[PDB]
Every structure is written in C-alpha cells, then in structure tokens.
Amino acid sequence: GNFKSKLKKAMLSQQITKSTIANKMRLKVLSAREQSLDGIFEETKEKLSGIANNRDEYKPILQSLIVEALLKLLEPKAIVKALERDVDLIESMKDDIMREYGEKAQRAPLEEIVISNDYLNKDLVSGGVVVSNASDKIEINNTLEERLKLLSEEALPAIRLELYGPSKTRKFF
Amino acid sequence: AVEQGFNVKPRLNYNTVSGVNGPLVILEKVKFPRYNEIVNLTLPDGTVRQGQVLEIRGDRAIVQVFEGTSGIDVKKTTVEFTGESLRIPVSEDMLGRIFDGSGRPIDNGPKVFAEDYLDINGSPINPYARIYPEEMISTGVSAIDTMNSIARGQKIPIFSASGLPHNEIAAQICRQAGLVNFSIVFAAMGVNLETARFFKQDFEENGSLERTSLFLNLANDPTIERIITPRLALTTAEYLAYQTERHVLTILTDMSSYADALREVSAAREEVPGRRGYPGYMYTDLSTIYERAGRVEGRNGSITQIPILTMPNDDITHPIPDLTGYITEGQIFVDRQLHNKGIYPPINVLPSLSRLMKSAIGEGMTRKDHGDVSNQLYAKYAIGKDAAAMKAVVGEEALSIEDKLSLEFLEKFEKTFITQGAYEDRTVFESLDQAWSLLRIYPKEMLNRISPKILDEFY
Amino acid sequence: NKKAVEQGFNVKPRLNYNTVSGVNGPLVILEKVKFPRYNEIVNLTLPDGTVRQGQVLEIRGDRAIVQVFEGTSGIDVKKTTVEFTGESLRIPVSEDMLGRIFDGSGRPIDNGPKVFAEDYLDINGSPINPYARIYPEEMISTGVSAIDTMNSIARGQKIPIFSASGLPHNEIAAQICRQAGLVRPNFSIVFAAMGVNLETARFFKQDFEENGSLERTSLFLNLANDPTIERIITPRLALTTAEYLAYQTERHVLTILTDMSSYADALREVSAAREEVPGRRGYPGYMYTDLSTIYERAGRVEGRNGSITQIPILTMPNDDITHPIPDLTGYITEGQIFVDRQLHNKGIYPPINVLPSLSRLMKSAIGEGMTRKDHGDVSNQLYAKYAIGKDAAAMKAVVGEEALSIEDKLSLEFLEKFEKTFITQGAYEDRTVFESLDQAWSLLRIYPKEMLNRISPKILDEFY
Amino acid sequence: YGAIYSVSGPVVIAENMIGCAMYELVKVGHDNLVGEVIRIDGDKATIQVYEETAGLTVGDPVLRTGKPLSVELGPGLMETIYDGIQRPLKAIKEESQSIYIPRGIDTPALDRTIKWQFTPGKFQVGDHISGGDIYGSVFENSLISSHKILLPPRSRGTITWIAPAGEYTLDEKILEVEFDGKKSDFTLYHTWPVRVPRPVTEKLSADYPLLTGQRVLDALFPCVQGGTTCIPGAFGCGKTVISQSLSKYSNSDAIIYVGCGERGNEMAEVLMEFPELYTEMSGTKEPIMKRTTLVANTSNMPVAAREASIYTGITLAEYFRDQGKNVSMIADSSSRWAEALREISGRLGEMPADQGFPAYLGAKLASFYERAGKAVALGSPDRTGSVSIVAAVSPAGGDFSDPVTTATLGITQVFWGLDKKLAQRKHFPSINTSVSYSKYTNVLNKFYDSNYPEFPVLRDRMKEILSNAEELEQVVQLVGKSALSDSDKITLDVATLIKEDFLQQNGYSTYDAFCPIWKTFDMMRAFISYHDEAQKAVANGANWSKLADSTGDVKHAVSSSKFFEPSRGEKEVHGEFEKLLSTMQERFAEST
Amino acid sequence: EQKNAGGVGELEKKAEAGVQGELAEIKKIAEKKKDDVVKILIETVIKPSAEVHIN
Numbered sequence A: 001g002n003f004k005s006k007l008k009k010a011m012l013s014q015q016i017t018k019s020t021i022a023n024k025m026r027l028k029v030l031s032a033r034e035q036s037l038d039g040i041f042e043e044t045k046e047k048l049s050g051i052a053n054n055r056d057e058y059k060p061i062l063q064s065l066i067v068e069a070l071l072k073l074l075e076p077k078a079i080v081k082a083l084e085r086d087v088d089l090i091e092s093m094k095d096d097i098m099r100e101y102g103e104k105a106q107r108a109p110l111e112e113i114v115i116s117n118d119y120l121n122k123d124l125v126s127g128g129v130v131v132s133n134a135s136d137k138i139e140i141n142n143t144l145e146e147r148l149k150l151l152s153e154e155a156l157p158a159i160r161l162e163l164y165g166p167s168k169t170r171k172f173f
Numbered sequence B: 001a002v003e004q005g006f007n008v009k010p011r012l013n014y015n016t017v018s019g020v021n022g023p024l025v026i027l028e029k030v031k032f033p034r035y036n037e038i039v040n041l042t043l044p045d046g047t048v049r050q051g052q053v054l055e056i057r058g059d060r061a062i063v064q065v066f067e068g069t070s071g072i073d074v075k076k077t078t079v080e081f082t083g084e085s086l087r088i089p090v091s092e093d094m095l096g097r098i099f100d101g102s103g104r105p106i107d108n109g110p111k112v113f114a115e116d117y118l119d120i121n122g123s124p125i126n127p128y129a130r131i132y133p134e135e136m137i138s139t140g141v142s143a144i145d146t147m148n149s150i151a152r153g154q155k156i157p158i159f160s161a162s163g164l165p166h167n168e169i170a171a172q173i174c175r176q177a178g179l180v181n182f183s184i185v186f187a188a189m190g191v192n193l194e195t196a197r198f199f200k201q202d203f204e205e206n207g208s209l210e211r212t213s214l215f216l217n218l219a220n221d222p223t224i225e226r227i228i229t230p231r232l233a234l235t236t237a238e239y240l241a242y243q244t245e246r247h248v249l250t251i252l253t254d255m256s257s258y259a260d261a262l263r264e265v266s267a268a269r270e271e272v273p274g275r276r277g278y279p280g281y282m283y284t285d286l287s288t289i290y291e292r293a294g295r296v297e298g299r300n301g302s303i304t305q306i307p308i309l310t311m312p313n314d315d316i317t318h319p320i321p322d323l324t325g326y327i328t329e330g331q332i333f334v335d336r337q338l339h340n341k342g343i344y345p346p347i348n349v350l351p352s353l354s355r356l357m358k359s360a361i362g363e364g365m366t367r368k369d370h371g372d373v374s375n376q377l378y379a380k381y382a383i384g385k386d387a388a389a390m391k392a393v394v395g396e397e398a399l400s401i402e403d404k405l406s407l408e409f410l411e412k413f414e415k416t417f418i419t420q421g422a423y424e425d426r427t428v429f430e431s432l433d434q435a436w437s438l439l440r441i442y443p444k445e446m447l448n449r450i451s452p453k454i455l456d457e458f459y
Numbered sequence C: 001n002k003k004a005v006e007q008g009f010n011v012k013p014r015l016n017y018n019t020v021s022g023v024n025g026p027l028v029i030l031e032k033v034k035f036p037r038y039n040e041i042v043n044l045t046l047p048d049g050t051v052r053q054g055q056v057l058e059i060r061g062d063r064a065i066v067q068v069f070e071g072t073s074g075i076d077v078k079k080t081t082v083e084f085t086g087e088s089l090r091i092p093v094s095e096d097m098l099g100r101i102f103d104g105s106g107r108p109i110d111n112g113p114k115v116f117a118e119d120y121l122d123i124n125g126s127p128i129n130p131y132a133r134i135y136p137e138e139m140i141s142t143g144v145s146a147i148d149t150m151n152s153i154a155r156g157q158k159i160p161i162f163s164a165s166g167l168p169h170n171e172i173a174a175q176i177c178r179q180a181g182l183v184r185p186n187f188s189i190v191f192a193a194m195g196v197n198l199e200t201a202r203f204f205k206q207d208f209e210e211n212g213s214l215e216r217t218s219l220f221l222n223l224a225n226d227p228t229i230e231r232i233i234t235p236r237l238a239l240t241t242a243e244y245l246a247y248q249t250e251r252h253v254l255t256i257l258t259d260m261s262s263y264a265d266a267l268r269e270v271s272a273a274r275e276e277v278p279g280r281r282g283y284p285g286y287m288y289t290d291l292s293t294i295y296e297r298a299g300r301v302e303g304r305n306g307s308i309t310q311i312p313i314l315t316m317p318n319d320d321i322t323h324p325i326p327d328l329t330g331y332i333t334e335g336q337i338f339v340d341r342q343l344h345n346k347g348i349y350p351p352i353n354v355l356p357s358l359s360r361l362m363k364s365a366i367g368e369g370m371t372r373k374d375h376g377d378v379s380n381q382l383y384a385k386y387a388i389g390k391d392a393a394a395m396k397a398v399v400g401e402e403a404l405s406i407e408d409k410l411s412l413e414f415l416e417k418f419e420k421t422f423i424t425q426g427a428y429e430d431r432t433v434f435e436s437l438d439q440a441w442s443l444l445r446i447y448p449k450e451m452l453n454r455i456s457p458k459i460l461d462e463f464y
Numbered sequence D: 001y002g003a004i005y006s007v008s009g010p011v012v013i014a015e016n017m018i019g020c021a022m023y024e025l026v027k028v029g030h031d032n033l034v035g036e037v038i039r040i041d042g043d044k045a046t047i048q049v050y051e052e053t054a055g056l057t058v059g060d061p062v063l064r065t066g067k068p069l070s071v072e073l074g075p076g077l078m079e080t081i082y083d084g085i086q087r088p089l090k091a092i093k094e095e096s097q098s099i100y101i102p103r104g105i106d107t108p109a110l111d112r113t114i115k116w117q118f119t120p121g122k123f124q125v126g127d128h129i130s131g132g133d134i135y136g137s138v139f140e141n142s143l144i145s146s147h148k149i150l151l152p153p154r155s156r157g158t159i160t161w162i163a164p165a166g167e168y169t170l171d172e173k174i175l176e177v178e179f180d181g182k183k184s185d186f187t188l189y190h191t192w193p194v195r196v197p198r199p200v201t202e203k204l205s206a207d208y209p210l211l212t213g214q215r216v217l218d219a220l221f222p223c224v225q226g227g228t229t230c231i232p233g234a235f236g237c238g239k240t241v242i243s244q245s246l247s248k249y250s251n252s253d254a255i256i257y258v259g260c261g262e263r264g265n266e267m268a269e270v271l272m273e274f275p276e277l278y279t280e281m282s283g284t285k286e287p288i289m290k291r292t293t294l295v296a297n298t299s300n301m302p303v304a305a306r307e308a309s310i311y312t313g314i315t316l317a318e319y320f321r322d323q324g325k326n327v328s329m330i331a332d333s334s335s336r337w338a339e340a341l342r343e344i345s346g347r348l349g350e351m352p353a354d355q356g357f358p359a360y361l362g363a364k365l366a367s368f369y370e371r372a373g374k375a376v377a378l379g380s381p382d383r384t385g386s387v388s389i390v391a392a393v394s395p396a397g398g399d400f401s402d403p404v405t406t407a408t409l410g411i412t413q414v415f416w417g418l419d420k421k422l423a424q425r426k427h428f429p430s431i432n433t434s435v436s437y438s439k440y441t442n443v444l445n446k447f448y449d450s451n452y453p454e455f456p457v458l459r460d461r462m463k464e465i466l467s468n469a470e471e472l473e474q475v476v477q478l479v480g481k482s483a484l485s486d487s488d489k490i491t492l493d494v495a496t497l498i499k500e501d502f503l504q505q506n507g508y509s510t511y512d513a514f515c516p517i518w519k520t521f522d523m524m525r526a527f528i529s530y531h532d533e534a535q536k537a538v539a540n541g542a543n544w545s546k547l548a549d550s551t552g553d554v555k556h557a558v559s560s561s562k563f564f565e566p567s568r569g570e571k572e573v574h575g576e577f578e579k580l581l582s583t584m585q586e587r588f589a590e591s592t
Numbered sequence E: 001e002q003k004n005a006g007g008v009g010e011l012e013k014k015a016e017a018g019v020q021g022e023l024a025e026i027k028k029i030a031e032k033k034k035d036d037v038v039k040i041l042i043e044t045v046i047k048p049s050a051e052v053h054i055n
C-alpha cells in the first residue's frame, strides 16, 4: 500500500510535466501566429514609408489626413505637427485645407492654421500629421504609423478571417 | 458570411486633466465625451493605463483608472479617447491562457489572436430565450450532490469566511463537477498569491489547463481592476459557452473583494451610499455579473457560475452576501463552527440552498428518493441542532428518546456524511445510499418527511 | 550663559482684525486675514469688552477659522476685533510656578501676581526622540500593596487610574501623591483638573495643604463652571509645566490628570461641533492621537535626571473597559490601576481590582536588585490564584459551595484573606514593598508547595 | 516652487503647483516639511505632510522634489532606528543636541562619513549586469557580514568600470553601467519608492517554519518563514511582547521592527535590551541589535507618517530579502496605520465607508500584506529570501469585529487571536486556542516529517484535548461537575495542566524566555504521554481520584518541565525529558 | 516506479515535432496571403473618411 501511495504522487508529477510541455508547445504555435502577423504589419510599414516617398501620390494623402483630423477637432484654429519633408507641401496646400474644412464642416473655414516648428521624428513617424488645438492641448495623432497601429489593434478579426479562414470551433455569430 | 470591417478612427489626445481625486481622473475640455468609454492615460513616465468614463458633464469626463492613479500629474498626462467601450479580444485560443486583471496575458505568451471583440458589459439575455437548467451536475461533494444540487446553468456561490477552505471546496467541485468536459473560466479578484498558486496547481494536476482560462487579479494588482476582471471573465465564458457551444464553469473568487473595489470607487465619486458605505447600485452591479450564467435556447452550451464569496464577519446579513443570495439561485454555506469541529467540507447544509434542486433532483434524472431523502435529512439535522441546544442548556437526561436518536444522527451526519476529505468522489447514488444508512437509525414510523411508497421501497 | 533671553527683546506689532465673515457654533470665521498661521492664538475682543482667547484651526486663502475657548456666545460681526498674536498658545513657565494655583487657561487664580516667566513654551510641545528617551526602570513605593506588589510603578511610567463615577479614585490618587517614593533611596506634583466639581478640587487642594505638598504643586483647576473648550488646553498646560520642571529643572514630577473622561467628553464636543469623523461612540477619530499627545509626554530622557510620571484619573461611563475612553487610554498609557465598584460595594479600600490592572513597566524595575528576587514570581502566582479564586466563587454561586473541590476551597479561602487583608489598606497607611511581599508570601503559604506552579523552584525553595 | 493655500490638520492644500504628481514628495513650508500629494484639484494639490503642521502660514513655499517617497536602501541600515520617513534618530539627536525631533530636519537616511570595506563580486568590466544582480559586498558588522550590494531594480546595462576592493563611503562611486550609450554611476546605496514592491524573480511557497520561541505559537499555530501573520487583541493582551520575543529569538536572519502608534517606551526598551541579548547564529555570540533595525513612529508623532513608517519598514525588509536573507517584518500596529488613514481621510472629506475607515483600507492592507512572501531574488547569482510580516492588529474596544481586524483576517494566513480574559490573570501568551488558526500546518508537514515526525500528530492530539475540555468546561459551568465520567475528568485535568504549564509561557523568565522547537516537541510528548497513560490506567479500572493522589508527583514533574533551561543544550534537555517519560510510565504502572 | 517516472518527463522531442507542422502551415498561409492582407491594410490606411461627428 505504501508503494502504491508513492506511485500516485509520482504519477501526478508526470501529468504536470506533460501539461507544462504541452502548454509550452501550445504557446509556441500561438507565438508563431503573432510572429507571422508581425510580418504582415512590418511589411505594411515598409510600403507605408514607400507611399510617403511618392511625392505625387502623397499630395491627396495629406489632403485627407489633415482635413479628417481637423474635422474631429472642430476648432477654428489649429497647429499642425509634421515631418520637415512635408512642411513645404503643407504650406502649398494650406488654402485647400481651409476650403475643404469649411466645406465639410457647417462652420466657416478655420481662421488660422500654422505648422509647428517642432517636427516629427524622422525614424518613428514616416508620414501624416499630428494636428493640435490652438493651445497645443488637444491633439490627434493622424500619422501613418499611428493609423496603422490603430488598424492593427482594431481590425484583427477580419485579418484572422482572411488569413486562417473561419473558426471551426465557433458556431454562432 | 462573417462581416468584419477595416476602419481607422483617429483618437483625440486630451492633455487637459483637471483633477486626479483618488482613483478618478477628471478631464476638463473633452469634445463630446462618451459614457463608458475606454481612455488611455499616457503617464509622464511613459507607461499607459487604461481608464473608463463613469460620468460626463458638458465638458468634463470623470475617468476611473484601472491601474491606479499613482504617478499621475496634470502638466504631462495625456488622455487618449478610444471612442468605444472596453472590448476584450475573445478567441477559442484563450483556453490554456493566464491573463491579468485587465485582460493582458501574463503566461509569457503572445497577445490573443482576436476572433471577435465583445463588449464587456454584455447584454441582458432574453428571458424568453433562456432554458430552465434541469441537468444536475454530479459534484463529488456529498453535501452538495445531496441536499443542495447544482445544475448546468446555475449561479450558486460559496458563502465562506476568512480562513475557511472555500478555495479547497471550489477546487474540489472543479476537479469533479461532471454530469449525473467542463471548461473553466477562473476569475481572481484580489486573492492572494497562495490562493492563485493553489488554483493553478490544482488545475495543472487535474489537467484543466488544456481547457481553462485564468484572469488573475492578485492582491498586489491594482484594486480598481477588480471591477473589470469579473466582466472580462464572464464575457469570455459567454463567448465560449454560446458562440462556441462549450460547457463553461465560471469560478469567481473574492466577490467580496470586488464589492470592496466598488465601494472604493463609489466613495471616491462621493455618491449617496447604501448599507455599510456600499454603492446603492451594488445590487444592480452584482446582478449584472451573476445573471450572465445559464442555458440559452438553441445554443448547446451553458455557464455554471460558482462565485466564491467570503462573508466579511461570517455574517450573512452583510450587504454583499445578502444581495448575492438574493440575486443568485442558491448558496453553499461554509461554517466556521464546522471548520472548528474539523469537518471538511464544512458545508453547513441548513443555510445552504439550491433553488434548482427541485427540478434537478426528480425521478429519471436521479433516483426517485432524492427529494424525500434530502427533506428528511434536513428535518432531522434541524432536530439534531435543536436537541444539541437543549442538551447544552437543560440537562441531558431530560432529552427524550427522539432527542437522543437525533443527537446520534447529528453526530454521524456531521462526522461521517458531511466529512468527505478531498479526492473522495462520492457519486450521487452512493451518497444517497449513505444518507439512507443514516436514516435507517430511525424507525420507519418516525420518518415523516419520507413518502410511504419511497419508505417501503428503500428502507 | 542663556541666549534665549536676547530673543525676548523684540516688539512685534500684531494686526487687529475687525473682519468676521461669520460665527457658527464654537467656531468664528475671519476674512481678509493677512497670512494666517495654523495654531496662532488670537484674542477676540467682544463688544462688551470681555476678551476671549481663540486659536485658528483651518486657514484657507485669506480666511481663518478660530475656535474660542470661552464659547462664541455674545460674538458680533460688526464690533468684535481679533488680534493675531502670530504664535501658537504659549504658557509662561517659570520655576516659581511650584506652589501656585492657576486656571484652565493658565491664568493665575491664586490671587497672586502673574508668573515671572523664565521661558515661553508652546503648550503642544514636541515628541520626545525615542533614542533620547530612557526606559524607566526605577520602582516607586506607592505604599499601596496592590500598586506596589502587583502593579509596581516605575519612575517614568504613565499608569492611569480607571474608576467609575462614584468610586474613590481621588482618595487613592491623593494617597499615591503623599506616599510616592523610590523603593531604594521628593516628587514635584503637577495637578491638572479638567471638569471636576468644586468639592473634588477643594478636596485635592486641602489634601495637598494638609500633607505639605502644596509647596511643590502647581494646580491647574478647570472646574465644571469653566468653559468646555479649554479642557483641551488644560492638560497641555500641565504637561508643558511638567516637561519644563523635569527636563530643564531636574525635578521628578508627578502629573495628575483627573477626569480625563471629562477631557475626552470636551474633545468629543469639539469634534461634533465640526464635521469630524465620529470614530466609536461619537468620539473623534483623532482621539487616539490627542490622548497620545497628552500621555506620551511622560518618561525619562537621556542626559537629564528629571522624570515625569502620569497618573491620569478616568471615569468609565458604565464601568466598562470596552468604552472608547478607557480602551484608548489603556492602549496609549503603560498600564492602568482599575478601581473596582464591586470591591467598593463589598467594603474594600483601596477597591483596586488587580485583574484588569496592569503595569507594563513592572518587567523592568522588578527583579533581584531593584526589589526582592521573588517579586515577579510572587505577583504572577498571586494573579493566577486570585483569578482561580474568582472562578471558584462564580462556580460556588452557580452550583453551591459543596460541589467545589479542595483546590477551589483553597482558592476561596485565599481570595477571602487576599481581598480582606492584602488589598484592604488604611487610607493613611503605607506598606513597604518588602512587607507587602511578606504578606503575599503568607497568602501563598495558605496553598501547599506543590500547587505553586508559577514560582520558579529555586525561589520556592528559598522563600517558602 | 508653489505656495500654501490651506492648512487644516495634517493635510495642506497647496496652490500654484501645476505639474505635481500623485504621491510625489514635496517640501511644504519654510522648514521643508516632508509631504506627499494625495489629490490634485487643478493647480491645487492636497498634501499629507509627514511632520507637525503648527506654524504653517498661507503663502509658504512648497518645493516639488519630483520623486515619490523613496527609502534609501544600502549598507548601514542594520543597526539603526528610523523616524518613519527614514530619518536616523541618532543623527537627529547628535545634530540637534535636543531630546526632541525638530521640524524639518534633513539628515541623510544613511551615515555618509562611515567607510565600508568593499569586496567586488564575480562581475567585472564588460559583464552584462541586470537589475538586482550582486556586483559586490560590504562588511557591515560581525553578525550581518557581507552586506551584498545590489544593482538597483530597473537598472540594467554593461559594466564599464567597477571599483576595486578597499574602503568606500556611500557617496563614493562604486560602479559605472553603460546602457544604450548613456553611462550610469552607481554608489553603495540606492533609493526605491516605498509604494512599489521591490521586484523578485519568482515567489515560492514558504515551507520552513518561523520558530517564534513561544510554545503555543510554535506548536499549535505555527508560522512559516515568508507568510503574513495577524495578532489581534486588546491592550495588555501581549501583542508587543510576542512581537519582541519573535524578533529576539526567531530563526530569521534580520528583523525589521516597525512601530506605528506604539509607545516611545517600547522603542526605548528595545534599544536598551537588544544589545544585551546575544544570538548563537553565524557561529559566534553577537548582539541581537546587530541584525535588527527599528522604524520608530510613535503615537504622538505626526499622524500621516504612520503609513510612511509601514512602507519604509516593508521596503527595508524587501531589500534584505532581495539580499537573500530570511527577514521578518514586525509591524507593531496595522490598526494604528489604519487609524492614521482614517484621520487623513476624515480631514480630506472622503466617504467614511465602515466605521470611518476609508474605503481603500482593505486594498492597502491587502497590498502591504502581499508584499511579504518567500521569493527568489531578482538577479544572478541565484539566492532565495523571505519576508514574514507579523503585524499586531489593535481592535477598538477589544472586539475582533473591527474593519481593520476583519480585513487583516481576510488577507493573512496565520491568526494568533488574543483573549483579554487570559490577558488578565497573567496567562501570557493569552492566545485564544478556540478562534486562532494557522493555515501553514498543512505545508509544514514536510519539515515536521523531516525533523520531528510526531510533531503534527501531537499537536492535533493536544488541539482535540483542548476542544474537548472547552466543551466540558462549558457544560460544567452551568450543570456542575458531579456527573462527569472518569475520561472527562482526565481530559479536564490534563487540559488545565496544559494551560497552566505548557501553553502559558513567562517570556521574562530565564527558563521560559525562549522555548526552542525541540523543547516544545519534547514537552508536548510529555504532556500527551501523561494524558494517554492516565486514560489507559483509568480504563484498566483505576479510580481517577486515587490515581491522581498516587501520581501527584508525576503530575508535578510534568508541570515543572518548563523550568528546564534550554541553555543546557538539546542533548542535556532531551536527556532529562527521556527520563521524565520513563519515570512517568513507571509511576503509572506501579500505581495501577 | 522511479525508473518509469523518469522516462515520462524526458519526452519532449515528440511534442516539439508535433507543433513543427503547425508552424510550417502558418508560414505557408502567411507567405500565400501576405500580398492580399497587406494590400487591403494599405487600402484602409491610405483611404480615410472625412467624417464630422454626428452631434
């Protein structure tokens, strides 16, 4: 009887040993999915930086990326933080930005929009602008990197459906 | 075809903070604040803490910070409004994962590959779409399997106190809670590392990590996340049980600690308090948590909540146990007196109750004598307690023959029937046979609660 | 020599505020105040000309909230002028205070001159550095057998006296004052009255005069007629006087704080006047801190031979230890001397119940060099057998005297001869600690040698 | 630099402080009083100053330090006494020449003039050092030798230069660590916020017992090295004496004795007596004071500083745990910490919750008690420490229904309840054996089976004897003892003997100041063998009265076994006990 | 019993190889649909909506 009791304790350790290896291998597959997913987003960042390089194609990008952010602020004055590369482009498109904001919003076009002297980091921000309130208090990070981060955070289920198909376990919804 | 949408919504970074009273951060110049909306407080240090909006004025938006307000300033703290309520990324891969109180994994694994984002608060399940739980869970515990039966879809807490083996009893039920396998969603709200390690070891030894999800909000973790943990665990359980058709056994622990978190938030908000300072809406919050368990029409899954509630001063009249017993479908009462006597499990059967026992302990589901035996055992145990009081007060010789027989019944009921020890695994039929062995002490004439047909058949 | 005098020669004009934003309860709120302090004492001049003295308690921007000691009755917004002294309450302290009778607010009610102050000391004082505080390990032969054999009092102990309303706590406390002395070879008593009646105050004055201690006592009489707000500052004045006379004058001081229940009642009234927390039984949540500020000013300090011993006299409402005042007082102080209504009704003087009584400074100051080597064992055995006797008496009342065993009968006999001969003591009779130990040894010799399990066997062999 | 706007009690709402962080340390007033920000209402910022508020004028400057309340860990802590905010009381006294503590003294938390012998560790130039790794050790005193110098947590990088062996002060550079091209200079000491627990690699299930030295605590309700412990009880019950005895005679490597709301005379007693006592650890007789530091914040000290004292003490314990030592924090009154919290809350205006104690009291107590536990230190080399928190709760009115007591019972694992009935009648330790419980009896079975296999069985037998005697006394007190059986009389007599001789321990007597684990086990064996022999002899047919008359000598020998001084050693004391059982067995056979 | 117990815990290469197929399948799916998923993510990021708040 004593030997049988000792074997029971050893057997319970074998289950823990098998479970620990099973869980470790199970998280290996899950970490492979995240690593594969990170390749999707890292490749997207490379093309997002590539699209910013195309000066002609980036002109309508910064048209929307500024007016869309200004329409959320709904402030008559704004401060635009942007890369030093895009400062001239914004200075050229400022009138179009004012007209588009005044058209999309029922209010009059914003009184004064000024490009902040402090420019975005070249390594981190690869495009877009970070507009702000007149007092530089309420700001919207509308950069391409921030937009991609928001998308990668809040669009995961559709990426799952595209890549790994539907969920076999799921039955409703 | 499943419809999921790609969309990018910019989020305003509000630098304006005008109050960090307690665990509440008060903003000043929010544009169209949204009630019950997740915000991210980027601290001056750099770390971000999640927050939830509890009240909005014309321009203010009071935010409760889950990770606490320690280190929050006004000049360099920016609050980023996500524009949507909290949506935990749910997936069938959550089984085997250990999450924090805020849903962030702590098992040294990747972020959960979301299959869908579900609102934490959920929605009230349609009463017409519910199914009355009739399948009886044959928990190994004799004091439960008999005399207070648990069904698939029941919300039956464990009313315990400080030092009582509520963790051991719940872990025993989880080990052996088969029908007459169960996925487990374990929510830890402010329990100590001893209890968390016990449960984790308990699951690993029994092999439950293949099909369990843990939300460990330890005592070291911030106290406000005790509000968010049970909702996260129960929406994960709802996802599994309904959208996946699993049989989830949700085990909340320290619901008293959750209510203490509510009181801490309610006191900070300076709201009008209820009994013992608890919020006047604590009944509604506890009901929202508890009523997320049950069977649903069409779906082949169920949720069986067993929230481990520790009564603060072993008093069932406390607001937390009172409202929990009023909301839930019963209670398992762990007795300090029985624990002192050395009885395990120290389940005091008299205060314990199972409202679904009546439908789950009929003929066909179990033996035809379950209800009669349970009622007779209850009556004789009450008579035994009264006889013990009479022996304590008046002289023992004054006790009648029935009183002496009932004292003997109490002795053998507590010391042989209730006393079970871990790993015992008494089947319902074996427990009923042992209960009959207990009831065979009395002559068949004395057994009033037993119907004559059952008495003739089984005595 | 003393450089603190030179700071005295400095006149400082004080603002005279005619602005009173409003008065509510015992608090008067001032407005447009120029840089208020937090405890500065202010002198309100009422329209009738009488001058109350108050101290600010909360100071918002250009606003001060004064509570006056003599009550707010008669205060008018238009005519009252407040003078901001600019410094917290400071009793004028001198060595000539020994032998005087002052009032609740420190004013001399002795019909003599104002005290020729040697230094102005803040009544609140400062906490004594625990490193700079010596552990009191010198017994005090209080004469009383109970307080000398079972509750021995050290030189710096702050052991209070717990009693009910009608008990003779004043009679016992006066006995200690007239008999206080070291076991191994005079105390400068400092008496503070807080809300006591005229009969009690006159009894204390006459007892001090009769025993000759009045030449070494500075009484602070604050009777029931006196305003109920300055019961707060009266013990502060007494303890500041004692702290001076001990730590700067090298005098061993007895501090008697009678009717600390009345002091705590005044504290509760002050707290309930504001929107403060009610604690337990209505007493403020900071009552522990205030009672600590009072009691913890006793003790001996390093490098200074002066010592202060505190014998506060409480008044338990229902003779219950569970009441907040006795509970917090026993939590803060270093013991208690429990005066028993049951013993008083039985006819024992002093009616000290030793079981609720305790002396935490007995462990030290009881030993083989300070007292006799058998003192601790004898006291422990006496408590054990007296409690056993009380339990045996209860069992006798319950199931008759015949059911008791030989041990219970011996316990009853020991309790009878202990309460009747040992605790009982004349009001003017003092017993040396060695004589009290001899009587205790006789009481133990009632028992056989075997049953004495608390006596170390060497002591039992040597002293039986 | 802000300004003071409102001073009401120990809280100071200071205006013109936009940018102040929560719990950020400030300097309120011209004397630079130490305070922590609680609320930030706009530019206003309510501060709980840790000093005396008397004399603060509206308009006094308030400096913003920028860092939270940070204890100063490092060499020199071990034999000192602190003021709650880690101010050395000896340094304050020496600098001020006054028996008082002046308001605003800014003495360094650690002596800077003292030169410490430094011995560099296995690390050298170029080795990648991580947070919590030991890069050297210093000789602090004879007892606590090699006070290992730890790299601060959250500090990491490659070692650029290390100081060679020699003598160094705390301000002198000891190490230079390069992280991402930025050099960081490290000294012998390092600061740590008291609010945040010091990180550990992984906590472990505590298994080695904490030998308190008291018989009942060590046998009936044992505590492990690394587990929270609660000691409720009214005044005079024995919580302070139990705590001091545990600190004196425990098997812990270091003691962090924290007194919040305790008298200054208890601190004076500890400072006076601890150097006199000696320990047999480390192979030599060294004073107890060489391995115990005191955080003294008495009851008359500022109210708000009790929380700072608790947190400073627990952080010192966590530091000596990360050093791999077996530390045991001793908080003198968690109830007084809670009363300080209640006073601050009432002065602030928060909702009273229960009894007036703030609604966050339970969470704060849970976090503080969760700081404790056995754990593996953060960095290499691998070493394991533990913090045992044995905190004495002080219920209001002597009732265990207080909110502080309820929260403490909910969070802690060991509950040493004290009954005032036994606190009177000199029955110390006045442990209530009916309500007290220890949840480490299950885990301690490994140690018991390894060293004293019969210890758990004997403890269970004594517990059931005590329970049976409690029931018998309850029935007898109302129905007399004229109907008890012989077995009932034996149980009552043996349990009265146990209460009078075994359970009660005179901690101030030489024989019973410290009853070690082996002596306690042997005396449990003696008492249980006495009870078993009496039961067997009476069951054989002997009348209990005659048996007691014949075996009074054996009963006296058993009851006087406590007088065996443990200083004789395990061999001598156990030799006498083996003869005690043999004589008792013979005197029960000859009588029968 | 001890000899049998030791063999059970050594078994990890089989478990590692079992998941090795899953990693290959994940890598294949990623290499197949990277173009499509990255292109649709790019379309979403590049094409915003100038939408004013409803209120």
Ligand SMILES: Nc1ncnc2c1ncn2[C@@H]1O[C@H](COP(=O)(O)OP(=O)(O)OP(=O)(O)O)[C@@H](O)[C@H]1O
Pocket: C330, C331, C332, C359, C360, C361, C362, C363, D233, D234, D235, D236, D237, D238, D239, D240, D241, D242, D262, D394, D428, D429, D505, D506, D507, D508
């Ligand atoms: N183990 C013991 N052995 C001997 N005497 C003891 C023991 N424990 C307590 N005592 C005695 O009882 C007294 C109780 O004082 P103690 O400091 O223990 O009180 P406490 O319960 O901690 O009070 P407080 O709540 O006021 O801090 C001691 O001063 C001592 O005289």
Ligand SMILES: [Mg+2]
Pocket: D239, D240, D262, D332, D392
């Ligand atoms: Mg104490």
